[PDB]
Amino acid sequence: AISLIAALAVDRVIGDTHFPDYEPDDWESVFSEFHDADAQNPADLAWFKRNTLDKPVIMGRHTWESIGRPLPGRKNIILSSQPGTDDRVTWVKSVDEAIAACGDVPEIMVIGGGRVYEQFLPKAQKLYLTHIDAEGHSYCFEILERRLE
Ligand SMILES: NC(=O)c1ccc[n+]([C@@H]2O[C@H](COP(=O)([O-])OP(=O)(O)OC[C@H]3O[C@@H](n4cnc5c(N)ncnc54)[C@H](OP(=O)(O)O)[C@@H]3O)[C@@H](O)[C@H]2O)c1
Ligand SMILES: [Cl-]
């Protein structure tokens, strides 16, 4: 199913480019790991790497341009209305085409940005979240699963 992964600050002001406001009543916390706040804490990246391991990643063009090189050993799927500008990754012109390009896999990872997260959140089954404190440090990694009726 579809999963989102994101890093969220505690007192965030949510506009269009941000991870959406999600309804806590609709999400079950299934894993929570708290840790010491450390500057440039290396575990932040390791968390992303572990959780995206060997899964297709979908991202919007802005996010693609902020990263700039393909995440290795992952099909990298970039959403853009325009023809692609990097032959190392897969380019698609709609959400449906992005899902289609992933094939039959156990899990699809959406890695941002705000416009892309907003379109995929309503179809998502899991969230992988890094919670960030008032001076920009992670303090907790969390996995949530969507609550079904
Ligand atoms: N909290 C987190 O962990 C996290 C993670 C990653 C990124 N981010 C933030 O997200 C920011 C980017 O957010 P963003 O909203 O500006 O951009 P974004 O979602 O990365 O990219 C938006 C671009 O993707 C393409 N796109 C999106 N939906 C589409 C659709 N349905 N059909 C076709 N193309 C589509 C469009 O590209 P064209 O203009 O080419 O048509 C659009 O301009 C970054 O600056 C970063 O700071 C946060
Ligand atoms: Cl939600």
Numbering used by the authors: 1 to 149
Extract from the study:
DHFR (EC 1.5.1.3) is a ubiquitous enzyme that utilizes the reduced form of nicotinamide adenine dinucleotide phosphate (NADPH) to catalyze the reduction of 7,8-dihydrofolate (DHF) to 5,6,7,8-tetrahydrofolate22. DHFR is an essential enzyme, and a clinically relevant drug target that is inhibited by the antibacterial compounds trimethoprim and methotrexate. Here, we examine whether it is possible to rearrange a protein structure with newly introduced amino and carboxyl groups. For the rethreading process, we selected dihydrofolate reductase from Escherichia coli (wtDHFR), which has been shown to tolerate a variety of circular permutations.
We determined the structure of rDHFR-1 to 1.60 Å. The space group was identified to be C2221, and two molecules were found in the asymmetric unit. All new loops made the designed connections and the rethreaded protein maintained the overall core structure of the native protein, except for the sites of the alternate loops, as expected. After structural alignment with the wtDHFR, an RMSD of 0.88 Å over 116 residues was obtained for Cα atoms. Interestingly, no NADPH was added to the crystallization trials, and the NADPH observed in the structure is apparently a result of co-purification. A part of the NADPH binding site in the B molecule was observed to be involved in crystal contacts and thus this site was not available for binding NADPH. Comparison between rDHFR-1 and wtDHFR gives an RMSD of 0.92 Å for all the atoms of the NADPH molecule. Additionally, rDHFR-1 did not show reducing activity towards dihydrofolate (DHF).
